[PDB]
Design a protein around this ligand. Structure first.
Ligand code: ADA
Ligand code: CA
Ligand code: CA
Ligand code: CA
Ligand code: CA
Length: 198
């Protein structure tokens, strides 16, 4: 496990990092601390640490407290080996349509949702651990567009509300090698038949 060459460095930022289409931001293990962008509370007007435009990728960062409004993803994004040490309002939001994959990494201390889906998308969480969270995935409340969520090799500990919540009857959640400890209720969807294994 060659840890990255920026490991032990801390980057203090005062504005959102914008990653453009076709660009990959590779932090090489850098820890990011945002200043002036939010306190990581549940206040809904914090800034994102990263804005990933459509077709942008992000890898190998640690997001330190304050988690602010985390990572905004505008579709067709891969987010690989990102560690949220203390999730802010949420960890990652899907803001526009496309495929978004979170592969590797982990999240801890989400007072409410880790992943927030606000546009129709295909959303995959793979090889991921999260501890002390309200929900792993939430589709924006009272919306009825379609998301399809895949949880593959995911381990969850201490889930206060549920693994995933959606108010959309057309949305679907598919899981494969999902391990959950200390969780209220697994899935808050209009019908449990929207949830499938594979
Ligand atoms: O964090 C977010 O994306 C969301 O959080 C809340 O659910 C809010 O009601 C939404 O409109 C959106 O702001
Ligand atoms: Ca929110
Ligand atoms: Ca937190
Ligand atoms: Ca948010
Ligand atoms: Ca919230």
């Amino acid at each position: 496990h060659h840890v990255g060459t920026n490991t032990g460095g801390v980057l203090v930022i005062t504005d959102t990092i914008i990653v453009k289409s076709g660009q990959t931001y590779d932090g090489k293990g850098i820890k990011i601390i945002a200043q002036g962008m939010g306190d990581g509370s549940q206040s809904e007007n914090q800034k994102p640490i990263f804005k990933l435009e459509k077709g942008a990728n992000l890898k190998n960062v640690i997001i330190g407290a304050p988690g602010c409004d985390g990572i905004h993803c505008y579709g067709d994004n891969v987010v690989e080996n990102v560690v949220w040490e203390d999730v802010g309002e949420d960890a990652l939001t899907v803001k526009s349509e496309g495929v978004v994959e979170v592969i590797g990494g982990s999240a801890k201390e989400a007072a409410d949702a880790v992943f927030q889906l606000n546009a129709p998308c295909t959303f995959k969480v793979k090889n991921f651990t999260a501890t002390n969270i309200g929900k792993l995935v939430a589709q924006n409340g009272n919306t009825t567009f379609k998301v399809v969520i895949y949880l593959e090799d995911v381990t969850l500990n201490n889930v206060k509300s549920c693994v995933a919540k959606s108010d959309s009857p057309v949305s679907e959640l598919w899981y494969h090698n999902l391990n959950v400890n200390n969780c209220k209720t697994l899935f808050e969807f209009p019908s449990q038949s929207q949830i499938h294994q594979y």
